[PDB]
Symmetry: C3
């Protein structure tokens, strides 16, 4: 046993004539999410230059050495104990993966990508050709390797150690650990104390698959199922069924009935992250196939030496059974030449210590995979903001939070924009606490205009296209315009021909009258209708054409009540009474 100091430099060599204990253990875990266990324990007499050492290594052959790092020492009386684990499981826990996210790549490329964060110290050897994906964010490298291991790969670690330090390190990726060995164990000559165990707790013949939810929120707990999938060639499955059954397994492990017939065994299997149907069926089929036969375990003391993970054959001639199994646990005592092994399926996972470890890991996982009050509030806020329109399209309910991040989220106005989003649109229709208004080019709030007011006072200037029909007009003042200074007015049941004037008041629209057709309250009754004239103005009933207009009656500018100067022009044929002197007399 060679001991190294903190810089991995050789210090001392301990022989086999001084050590009091030397034990090495290896074990392949039942689950695929755990690494391979490797522990060494050595204890010798107390020394003063062995309390600074941090590494210890043993010998496999002339070219391969295994390195163990001390985790704990215990001086008792004068005997120093020690305890070590593999170097890789302790070194690869101090590299941080910021964020890595492959999508549908092979395992070899994923390992290449992960081992980039170790700064070229670690390499990799071997390959697998299965495609998978994962999301690695802030986490250690060992956890990432654990996650990769679940896809069907098994990992090891090695060194190239000399007396002056470590030179090269690499990681081997394989499918199954161990080649096939030419070993032969016989009970009574090579295997000494054989204990055979058989278990039948978990046996199924039919399973019902379930998926990742259908309509969550109703509370009815629906899940995706393979109800309407046809699948014939591997195992005949009908179209109206919802479970996979193997016939012969039912005949061999079924529940007998009254009539001598057999019935199947059905248990429910849940997959939390399956969204398709065919892959759910494949997963359920694999789960059914894995759990169809009882488990067998052999545990014994052996003479011949085998590595971990080989295939060996064990025989027993007195009771006449013959099996082929796979070594999965080895406890090698170097000092006393005693070797203990185990073959077959692993049933060591039901001991108390493993259960304690699994419970602690489960608590630690649940603490990080579930959502507390803050996360629920944040998710609700995000999903409400998505539908309110605060991130996308043309309809939006504004709140001060959308502008300052600091005030309340309470809405005070509703905005309909032109295109896209707030910065991508040019026109706005705003509904706020002042009335339905409009906003110009930019939403820096040029100035808010008003079309409707909340008390209900429409603004008339917004009528700019169309034809008006089918209504009544009353009380209003009408007017027209020309290039000169003449306009027609209808104010208070009056027709006014006057001169133009520009103003901003209802009363000030009226100008200087010249001719006003009207009516007069004639003698306490409204039976007088006539026009009027005004002096210094010309009036007429001019006749002719569009270019020429000659006076039928000419009204002078000086026409007055006193100066009744009733000019007339034009050849007029006057049928009716005529006047020269006194008394009416007829004509032509």
């Amino acid at each position: 046993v060679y001991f190294f100091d903190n810089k991995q430099q050789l210090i001392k060599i301990k022989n086999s004539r001084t050590l009091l204990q030397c034990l090495q253990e290896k074990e392949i875990a039942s689950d695929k999410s755990d690494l391979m266990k490797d522990v060494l324990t050595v204890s010798c007499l107390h020394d003063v230059e062995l309390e600074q050492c941090d590494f210890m290594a043993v010998r496999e052959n002339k070219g391969v050495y295994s390195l163990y790092k001390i985790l704990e020492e215990e001086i008792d009386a004068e005997i120093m104990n020690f305890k070590g684990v593999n170097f890789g499981a302790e070194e690869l826990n101090n590299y941080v993966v910021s964020d890595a996210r492959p999508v549908k790549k092979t395992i070899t490329e994923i390992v290449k990508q992960i081992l980039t964060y170790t700064d070229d110290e670690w390499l990799m050897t071997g390959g697998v050709n299965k495609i998978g994906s994962a999301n690695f964010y802030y986490a250690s490298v060992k956890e990432a390797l654990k996650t990769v291991q679940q896809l069907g790969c098994e990992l090891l670690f090695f060194c190239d150690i000399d007396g002056e330090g470590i030179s090269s390190k690499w990681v081997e990726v394989r499918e199954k650990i161990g080649k096939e060995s030419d070993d032969r164990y016989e009970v009574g000559s090579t295997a000494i104390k054989v204990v055979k165990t058989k278990d039948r707790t978990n046996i199924v013949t039919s399973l019902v698959g379930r998926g990742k939810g259908e309509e969550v929120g109703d509370g009815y707990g629906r899940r995706l199922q393979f109800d309407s999938i046809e699948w014939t060639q591997p195992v005949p499955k009908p179209k109206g069924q919802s479970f996979i059954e193997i016939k012969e397994l039912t005949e061999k492990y079924g529940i007998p009935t009254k009539k001598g017939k057999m019935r199947k065994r059905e248990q429910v299997v849940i997959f939390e992250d399956i969204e398709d149907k065919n892959e759910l069926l494949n997963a359920t089929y694999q789960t059914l196939l894995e759990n169809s036969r009882p488990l067998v375990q052999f545990s014994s003391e052996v003479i011949g030496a085998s590595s971990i993970g080989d295939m060996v054959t064990i025989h027993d001639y007195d009771k006449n059974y013959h099996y082929e199994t796979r070594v999965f646990a080895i406890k090698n005592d170097i000092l006393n030449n005693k070797i203990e092994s185990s073959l077959g399926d692993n049933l060591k996972g039901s001991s108390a210590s493993n259960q304690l470890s699994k419970a602690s890991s489960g608590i630690s996982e649940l603490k990080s995979m579930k959502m507390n009050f803050y996360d629920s509030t944040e998710i609700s806020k995000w999903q409400s903001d998505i539908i309110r329109g605060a991130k996308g399209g043309s309809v939006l309910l504004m709140s001060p939070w959308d502008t300052n991040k600091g005030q309340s989220r309470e809405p005070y106005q509703m905005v309909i924009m032109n295109k896209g989003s707030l910065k991508e649109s040019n026109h706005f229709l705003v509904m706020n606490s002042e009335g339905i208004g409009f906003i110009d080019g930019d939403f820096d709030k040029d100035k808010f205009e008003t079309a409707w007011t909340i008390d209900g006072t429409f603004n008339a200037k917004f009528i700019r296209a169309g034809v008006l029909s089918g209504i009544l007009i009353k009380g209003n003042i009408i007017k027209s315009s020309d290039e000169g200074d003449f306009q027609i007015v209808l104010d208070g049941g009056e027709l006014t021909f006057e001169k133009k004037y520009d103003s901003e008041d209802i009363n000030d629209q009226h100008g200087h009258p010249m001719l006003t057709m009207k009516a007069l309250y004639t003698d306490d009754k409204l039976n007088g209708i006539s026009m009027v004239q005004i002096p210094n103005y010309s009036f007429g009933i001019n006749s002719g054409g569009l270019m020429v207009s000659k006076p039928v009656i000419e009204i002078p500018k000086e026409s007055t009540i006193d100066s009744r100067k009733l000019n007339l022009f034009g050849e007029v044929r006057v049928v009716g009474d005529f006047y020269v002197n006194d008394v009416k007399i007829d004509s032509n």
Copy 2:
């Protein structure tokens, strides 16, 4: 001990002269959610034809047999070992219950309903008259029976076994297991080694109840309490208080004070699914009543034989105590005539193995009853959709998700319908990225018109009912119409009478002039008001009635500036000077 093969056919009988161990254990669990434990263990010498057996049974009396299913087997030193459990706890785990949901029914009917999923194999015997409800979805029958058992029933299982297989199976429902036996145990003659234990850990005299939330979201953690419920006859409880206290229990187990008085003990009890007040009070009262006395347990070796669940009486004359207890655990050894029993309240739930089992079950329950990111997102989406209007009432915000299910959830228009929902309404008011518009009968076809445009151009054709008053009209063109071809036009500050015409342009409304009362720019000043005429048209100031109007002045069709033929008609009284051959005249 009789051994059966995989089809429940008798194979071999083993005597008592060749067995090495036979042990049978029974135990009633402390909690009501666990079944009754039944375990048998037997070991004999190795045999070839015993490695295929799957059932082993023992004898109770001449008509009752108990059947055990082998779960494990272990050849160690040609000494085979077997371990078995009850058949019922293993067979009823392979029957899937899908979607069974009773509401407010009796336990007997619930068990009858559950046992219809076993295909007539299992029956039921007995009954309990208590009302309860449960929700069973995809799950096995055993878990359903476990859930039912929590409502105040206790279950057993039985068979009717013969040499050629099982004939009938049934499940018995009871209130308490065991009748009242006539047995008497005396210490020193019938009971050998007696160990008595007394516990005082959980002792209370007052409790404060809490309910299923009040206003969750504030984060203040309010809960429903019985603050304002009066309850007098069982135990006097005032109105202003929020806890139940029994006086004598306080006097007997109260904290002494400085003045020699006693104080109560208060602890908080939480019920997660209580929504009313009186039932919360009843539950708190029952919890208080249950936990008011210290616990006692007896464990001893017994000569006499009793079944499980009976009521036996134990006496001790030297120390002078006499108690009446209930048997709850029996460990019967058939081969050596040794019986071990326990009496009183169960305190076996604090051992390490039970704690490990409870921790595993608790973790597995938490993994299923708490929600991750996906469930929170789905619930938020559902609750946002409810309030957006996408499922119900008359105000709704459209998004592409509501029509095509594949695009984003971002809104782009707001729709107000007529009645009900999208398919139950005929008329629509729509405000989208092109202005306030309207939609006809069917919404599936856009057919979108516009009333307001986002730049603010109202369409005038939408004014169809009302009276218009209190505004000004300027610049606009006015027109009327009749059945014939006459209309009145006010264009450019002139009154124009023409012939009617139909057109679609502002300029084309004007027609063929006949008489245009207008004004003339008379000598660089606007003081000329006059009419005009046009040849080949008739003009007049006709006078008379509504039927008839005769010309005061008749304007001929040929009236012209050149041909000044101004025909006049009617009896006229022309007072004033006149024009006859250069003289002034008078009234004859």
Copy 3:
């Protein structure tokens, strides 16, 4: 040993010549969230009057006594056993804190405030000057003290016990338990069996801190980090880095590389309730300083007597080491004068029982601090109601739930109010399933108007301010009014002067005609423009001023087709040929 009854009255004294066992244990837990352990165990021969006692006490010196409360009692064979804990840890579990919520106060004031719920039985002694805050709701006092202890204080409990009961109780608050003692332990003379353990499992040199989320909802898992904080004087930390590193620790405990250089060790530390950067950096620095050196533990059997928590010194001359450690566990045996102690850092937390207890506590905490279906639904409802406007501002989508609390949540109308909320505003713009309408002062009523209708029918009476221009008017009836009974009408392609009238129909607006400027269908062609008169009415073309208008032609009330009476007034100047019994005449 003195035994008390249920009222804490002395009953019996047991000497040292009758007891069979007496053992006292004390231990300081590794975590700061657990109290100080104190356990006593005594056993003696069975006595009749010792089965009612509930307290047993021992002697420290002539003035200090320790009180223990019996929890379990076990009569076995003829020897009674007992098991007691400290009085305080059992008494202070029966006082209920309703709600206390201090903010940024000192520990002394927090303890003072908490100890007001014991009704002046418990006092306080000592003090610590550090500022902290906590939120206490319904919970017992012991959990509150546990939570306070996490801020850097350590608690003890005491009594003033006499033969007639307890007189005064108090709690001492300290920062560290134990003074500095003048003790000297030498191996081989005063310490007998020394076992030393050194642990190196968790050693780090650099850490990466994380905070309380950044944008939860995207699913990317961002967290607050100290990326852009400069912090130099304690440890030089640059501006572009995301971790804190100590140099010399890396030089002493670093991973050696190929070229002889050393590398750092990084692990991720998560704080779930940190929102600022400088405090996150401080917490990470404190963790790094706490986890930088390996741990050492001494366990031995000593001769001299020391209290719990002192600082002693242990020496060993043969192996030449000298350490200064702190006592943390004492197991004093009173009957046999044997004392067993432990020194240094506590490594007793990895035993099986402690792990079981921690797992149970973790499950119980997770069950209470996570959210199930009901909580998620309630939070989503609250956060949707906040943004819908149902609590605050001036835009609101009202649903029947907002008024009756019992019906569904689907919205049926949208309301825009004036100010604040429903009760603080006067004018409303309501958009519902009937049309865009308005509501007067109070909203509790249903005085709903209708401007728009869903079929697109505007109401013309809502135009009340503005100027109308740029449109066309067609078909509509135009009218005016005056104080008298005259109005100008333009209906059916004609101009009508008539008498004013009031009505509510389109047809009834027309009145009694007087003068109707119109057109006549003159001989199958529309070339006739004419006016008419009506008998018993006066007509004229009056001329003059605004005050005076004299008839150019006077039309009498009796003017008729038969009674042609065309009165003319005013001195005329008439050029033309005239009618003097035929031919043609001259023109003055």
